[PDB]
Design a protein around this nucleic acid. Structure first.
Length: 225
RNA sequence: GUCGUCAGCUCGUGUCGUGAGAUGUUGGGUUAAGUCCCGCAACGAGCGCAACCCUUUUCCUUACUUGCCAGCAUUUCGGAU
């Protein structure tokens, strides 16, 4: 399942953001800049990606759940599809402060979501009048939109696959506080200090995101054989 | 009594500060109203608001006197009988 390099060039991980927004901590990975924007070297990206995929394979074999976190408007659909394929909890939408920091409070929210889903399945929804009917349908919509992905999950994930660290900065901080490992994609503008596993490459390109998510999903599938 | 029929008040869990503390109630629409919806280190529960109470507007069921008079009958033509 290793990308082997050419797929990375064709996907376009080489591109990066403009120089003026560069983070000084990426200097080791910048290598050079062909044009005004920076060009990252995939020579370091490949081995780091392989190591991250191997660690994900080991965790999948151990059966511990891995949580995917990618929220960029371009990456939402791709990460949702890949997470559904892998059969793992996902957070496609905006991060809500306390997915991991305060799990006990989210227990009640997901319990109520499941209860209202059971209500919809049962005839009680039909028994209730139309105004309440639309109110609780709208409630279903809202909490399914907010916490739909993590409904199945019952325990904190053993690893966090983060698409874009500076964007989803809160998630990395919570993961560091808890001690849960984070494997993440980082670009030139972001800071890698708090990422346990760093695979540096472009994330804006929908097609690079598709490549990365497909690789992770393939590793998850290979796990458990 | 009054501000004043003014719209605010409280409290549960995590995060930021060495700390007293802060974050919920802030932002944009909307309403008689922190009423309702979009925003987002926040997450939801209670008291205030509203509704539950009395009266008025159309119709239905029970009730037919001491209240009523469409149909009928007698009339000192007055529902008087």
């Amino acid at each position: 399942y290793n990308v082997s390099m050419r797929d990375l060039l064709q996907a376009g991980a080489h591109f990066g953001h403009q120089t003026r927004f560069w983070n000084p901590k990426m200097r080791q990975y910048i290598f050079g800049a062909r044009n005004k924007i920076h060009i990252i070297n995939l020579e370091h990206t490949v081995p780091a990606l392989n190591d991250a995929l191997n660690f994900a394979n080991q965790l999948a074999s151990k059966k511990n759940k891995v949580l995917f976190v990618g929220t960029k408007r371009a990456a939402s659909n791709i990460i949702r599809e890949q997470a559904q394929r892998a059969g793992q909890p996902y957070v496609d939408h905006r991060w809500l402060g306390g997915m991991l920091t305060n799990w006990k409070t989210l227990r009640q929210s997901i319990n109520r979501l499941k209860d209202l889903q059971t209500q919809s399945q049962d005839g009680t929804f039909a028994k209730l009048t139309k105004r309440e009917a639309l109110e609780r349908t709208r409630e279903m919509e809202k909490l399914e939109r907010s916490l739909g992905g993590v409904k199945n999950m019952g325990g904190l994930p053993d690893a966090l696959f983060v698409i874009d660290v500076d964007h989803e900065a809160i998630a990395i901080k919570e993961a560091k506080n808890l001690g849960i490992p984070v494997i993440g994609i980082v670009d030139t503008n972001s800071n890698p200090d708090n990422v346990d596993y760093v695979i540096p490459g472009n994330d804006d390109a929908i097609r690079a995101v598709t490549l990365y998510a497909s690789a992770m999903a393939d590793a998850i599938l290979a796990g458990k054989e």
